[PDB]
RNA sequence: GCCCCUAAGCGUGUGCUAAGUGGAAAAGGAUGUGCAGUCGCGAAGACAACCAGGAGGUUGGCUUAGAAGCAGCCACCCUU
RNA sequence: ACCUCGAUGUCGGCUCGUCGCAUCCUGGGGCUGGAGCAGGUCCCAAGGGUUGGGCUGUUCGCCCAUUAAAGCGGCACGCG
């Protein structure tokens, strides 16, 4: 499990503020802040479209190599600001990471398969948080449900993980719950 | 050019066949007597019959093997199939009856081998919600 | 000849067209013929 | 159907052709699935009957020297490979065509050569 | 009919329409959801009608979550009454809905019927609404 | 309601700058 | 578009004259005249065809292209061969017969009904229930055929009336 | 504000609009058109058009006067 | 509660009208669970027409004979 850094160009922000931020967003750019253990924050602006393509390809936790005026920097997408309505990316928080470093990351969990036809599958956790090497974080985690009978609970302990990644959250976290399929009359009392 | 399912030892029922055979230009009494003779020779199961018509009102009846549904029902000992297949299991069938019905369907089907017909019968029992063992 | 502010292709045979600035639905089934009025 | 599926089909056709002593190319327009099932019954014991795309076989024909069969791919294409012997499928197709009358024998391939209708009829008599 | 069991004050000012939603802006329970685009009071009976519509379209499987609860009451004076003489009695319960709020959530196997049922729901609401999913 | 609509709509002129007395 | 870039062949006995936008075609069945729209350019392909060209790719030109091409094709095939469309009449007591150029119908009315023959078109009755309409211009033939067809209102129950050659009308049943 | 009434531009450059929209209005309906961006297929010949096929089990069961791929309910398979 | 209290006469009925169309009749259509006769529903259409009496103050309403029909509204709930 090895991931290659994604190449993006960054420009140091001449001016910071809300006016500057709105102008930059209007110019097809996204503002961001790069900070890390080095105790040295930098205010940058990125190309929105390239950044969005990178996120589409490699998820919300993607390793990045940034070209700050000819200097290559390794960074991780620590946080995002997505507008609720327009669903843009208003701001990015990037975390400075070096090779062979352990970081805490929230990785999404998706399910596949076909349980017993008389059952309904519900997902209670969108993501679980994991300790992993900076370049070795997994794109996503999968849980397979098939032949699952009646009330069966899948917890964070039972989920499978790649090699070299450690799960931090308590295994008691109910991720997926398989329940008996609600009957036709069962839908009429909920919400009444 | 029709096909129906009719009881072996019974002839001339009003709902299923009468008006169905009346508007297809088929003589009914000769068909009923010949079919009754054939299915009294068989005497075992209700049968599907396929009717092929000609321009001179001549009719030819083809009698297939007993249906997989009826054969499985009579081999499993139950009378009616499961209303909720794969949820409620009403009967159990062993591989010997499955292979007998597989030979019958090999006489009926296009399956190259007996095992294919056995798998077809197993799928039929799956549509019946009846375990095949 | 339905005359409604909302016209839709009831069956798969229905076609939606425009005639003289009006949205219309034409079909082989005469019931399904309708216009936006 | 994906282009990778097209490549896989080309490879499968080439692999089947490499193990076949001969092949027969015929026309099947005007045949029900019941007729094709009967033909598979007649052929499936020993020979193999298939129908594939013209250009997919054309690319699958570039492997060996059957590249001259491309002119037989104008129109419907039905391939018959002879895994057991070489000419059982020849009589099978000829009788099927004579009985059904909707089959046209485009040609055959044997001994490294492509042969026409009369030539294939003579070969089947051998 | 969703009615709160008890409210501390039975006569309240109108919930304010300013701003856009801050919380509950993303689907969290089910696979699919209805996101609002307009500011409105949504009553309990509109919620009931929309819920019944979803249930009828979906029939057996799947599960429906309602993230909105009508706990804010609105009052009216009795008919043909001149202005004055105190506030009227409260007689319908509403929930304050801002754009970006996710109102309903649905969990059902297939895409098409889920979208159709949600659309049947939106056709019962006094707002512009759209359908959203779990994925970004 | 045409009269009130027309007054409150001519509110929106270039010269009035979006406001008129009596709305 | 797709229709537009297909040049129209000219039969041997066909004379074609282009005068600016105007076009005239003379052949065994007679002469016909057409005019094309300004954005569409018409040219005589020396290999014996007609070429229509639109300089632009905008909506209006792209729409007029195929229109003009098909108009020219119909124009030439009208004079080379012609147009002839056949009609039947269904029902008891429904009949047709010609009075010289005119066509006379008995359609169950109190009075018999008559149709003139407009210029450039002829009627030819074959049997008291089957007749034909022939002309060199497709549009006029279609117009008169539709007028003949509308003579008696649709009858879903018994199917009485005038029908086209292969027309399959919808029918219901009046049970009572 | 600048065609004439009515003082001053039927101003210049690049696009859009066919509705007299401009010169009133909602939920909602819709192959109107322009721009920008994704995904699918496509010369290994794409879509449309024209030709041939779309079978056997089997009428899968429960349900009914009736259930045959086409009230409804459950499973929702196998062979060539 | 914005004009009118140094005065803007109020319900029915009569006489005279005038306008709208959201059409009662007459006219033209589409779909029908439209066989025919007769209907149901929607669309276009304001040219003309749209009765006489008994009871109730009566607005309203019930009823008797008819008629193709006995339309609904605005005009200071038109008009002292
Ligand atoms: Mg509707
Ligand atoms: Mg406030
Ligand atoms: Mg909050
Ligand atoms: Mg939230
Ligand atoms: Mg709505
Ligand atoms: Mg109003
Ligand atoms: Mg105001
Ligand atoms: Mg003046
Ligand atoms: Mg001037
Ligand atoms: Mg200017
Ligand atoms: Mg100018
Ligand atoms: Mg100008
Ligand atoms: Mg200009
Ligand atoms: Mg206007
Ligand atoms: Mg509007
Ligand atoms: Mg809409
Ligand atoms: Mg658009
Ligand atoms: Mg089948
Ligand atoms: Mg049934
Ligand atoms: Mg006052
Ligand atoms: Mg006063
Ligand atoms: Mg005075
Ligand atoms: Mg006075
Ligand atoms: Mg008057
Ligand atoms: Mg009108
Ligand atoms: Mg009428
Ligand atoms: Mg009518
Ligand atoms: Mg009128
Ligand atoms: Mg007049
Ligand atoms: Mg009046
Ligand atoms: Mg009045
Ligand atoms: Mg008055
Ligand atoms: Mg007066
Ligand atoms: Mg008075
Ligand atoms: Zn239709």
From TrEMBL, chain F:
Q: Where is this region: Disordered?
A: 1-23
Q: Which Pfam families does its entry note?
A: HR_L37
Q: Which organism is it from?
A: Mycolicibacterium smegmatis (strain ATCC 700084 / mc(2)155)
Q: What is this protein called?
A: Uncharacterized protein
């Amino acid at each position: 499990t090895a991931n290659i850094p994604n190449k993006l160009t960054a420009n140091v922000r001449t001016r910071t503020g809300k006016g500057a931020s709105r102008q930059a967003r209007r110019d097809g750019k996204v503002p961001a802040v790069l900070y890390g253990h080095g105790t040295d924050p930098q205010h940058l602006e990125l190309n929105a479209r390239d950044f969005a393509a990178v996120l589409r390809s490699h998820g919300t936790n993607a390793i990045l190599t940034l070209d700050i005026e000819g200097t290559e920097q390794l960074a991780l997408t620590k946080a995002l600001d997505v507008h609720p309505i327009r669903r843009n990316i208003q701001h990015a928080d990037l975390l400075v990471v070096q090779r062979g470093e352990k970081v805490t990351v929230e990785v999404t969990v998706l399910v596949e398969g076909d349980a017993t036809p008389g059952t309904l599958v519900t997902q209670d956790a969108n993501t679980i948080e994991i300790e992993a090497e900076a370049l070795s974080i997994p794109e996503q985690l999968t849980v397979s449900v098939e032949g699952v009978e009646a009330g069966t609970q899948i917890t964070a302990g039972q989920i499978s993980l790649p090699e070299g990644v450690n799960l931090i959250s308590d295994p008691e976290l109910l991720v997926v719950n398989v329940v008996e399929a609600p009957s036709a009359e069962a839908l009429e009392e909920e919400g009444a | 050019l029709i096909k129906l399912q009719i009881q072996a030892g019974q002839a001339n029922p009003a709902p299923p066949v009468g008006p169905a055979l009346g508007q297809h230009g088929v003589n009914i009494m000769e068909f009923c007597k010949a079919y009754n003779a054939a299915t009294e020779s068989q005497r075992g199961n209700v049968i599907p019959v396929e009717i092929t018509v000609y321009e001179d009102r001549s009719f030819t009846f083809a009698l297939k093997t007993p249906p997989a549904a009826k054969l499985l029902l009579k081999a499993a000992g139950v009378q009616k199939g499961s209303g909720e297949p794969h949820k409620t299991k009403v009967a159990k069938v062993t591989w010997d009856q499955v292979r007998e019905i597989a030979e019958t369907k090999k006489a009926d089907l296009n399956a190259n081998d007996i095992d294919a017909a056995a798998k077809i019968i197993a799928g039929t029992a799956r549509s019946m919600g009846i375990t095949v063992e | 000849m339905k005359v409604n502010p909302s016209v839709k292709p009831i069956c798969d045979k229905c076609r939606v067209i425009r005639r003289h600035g009006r949205v219309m639905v034409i079909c082989s089934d005469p019931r399904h013929k309708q216009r936006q009025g | 159907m994906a282009k990778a599926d097209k490549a896989t089909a080309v490879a499968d056709i080439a692999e089947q052709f490499k193990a076949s002593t001969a092949t027969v190319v015929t026309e099947y327009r005007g045949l029900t699935v019941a007729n094709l099932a009967e033909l598979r019954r007649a052929l499936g014991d020993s020979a193999t009957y298939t129908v594939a795309k013209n250009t997919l076989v054309k690319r699958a024909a570039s492997e060996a020297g059957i590249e001259g069969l491309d002119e037989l791919f104008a129109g419907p294409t039905a391939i018959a490979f002879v895994k057991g012997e070489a000419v059982d499928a020849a009589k099978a197709i000829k009788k099927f065509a004579k009985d059904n009358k909707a089959l046209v024998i485009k040609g055959g391939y044997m001994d490294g050569k492509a042969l026409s209708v009369a030539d294939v009829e003579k070969i089947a008599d051998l | 009919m969703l009615i709160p069991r008890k409210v501390k004050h039975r006569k309240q000012h109108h919930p304010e329409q300013r701003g856009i939603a801050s919380g509950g802006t993303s689907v969290s329970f089910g696979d699919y959801g209805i996101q609002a685009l307009e500011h409105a009071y949504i009553t309990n009976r509109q919620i009931e009608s929309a819920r019944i519509a979803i249930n009828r379209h979906i029939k057996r499987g799947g599960k429906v979550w309602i993230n909105i609860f009508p706990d804010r009451p609105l009052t009216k004076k009795p008919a043909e009454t001149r202005m004055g003489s105190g506030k009227g009695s409260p007689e319908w319960w509403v929930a304050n809905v801002k754009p970006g709020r996710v109102l309903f959530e649905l969990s059902y196997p297939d895409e098409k019927t889920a979208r159709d049922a949600l659309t049947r729901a939106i056709h019962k609401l006094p707002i512009k609404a759209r359908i959203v999913t779990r994925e970004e | 309601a045409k009269r009130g609509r027309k007054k409150r709509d001519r509110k929106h002129s270039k010269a009035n700058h979006g406001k008129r007395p009596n709305a | 578009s797709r229709i537009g870039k297909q040049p129209v062949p000219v039969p041997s006995g066909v004379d074609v004259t282009i005068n600016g936008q105007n076009l005239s075609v003379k052949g065994p069945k007679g002469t016909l005249t057409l005019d094309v729209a300004e954005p569409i350019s018409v040219s005589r392909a020396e290999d014996g065809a007609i070429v229509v060209t639109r300089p632009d790719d905008e909506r209006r030109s792209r729409s007029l292209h195929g229109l003009s091409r098909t108009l020219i094709a119909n124009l030439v095939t009208g004079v080379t061969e012609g147009y002839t469309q056949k009609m039947e009449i269904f029902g008891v007591g429904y009949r047709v017969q010609l009075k010289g150029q005119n066509l006379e119908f008995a359609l169950g009315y109190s009075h018999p009904v008559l149709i003139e023959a407009p210029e450039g078109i002829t009627f030819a009755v074959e049997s008291p229930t089957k007749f034909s309409v022939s002309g060199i211009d497709k549009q006029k033939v279609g117009q008169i055929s539709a007028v003949i067809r509308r003579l008696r209102r649709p009858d879903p129950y018994k199917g009485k009336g005038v029908r086209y050659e292969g027309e399959q009308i919808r029918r219901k049943v009046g049970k009572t």
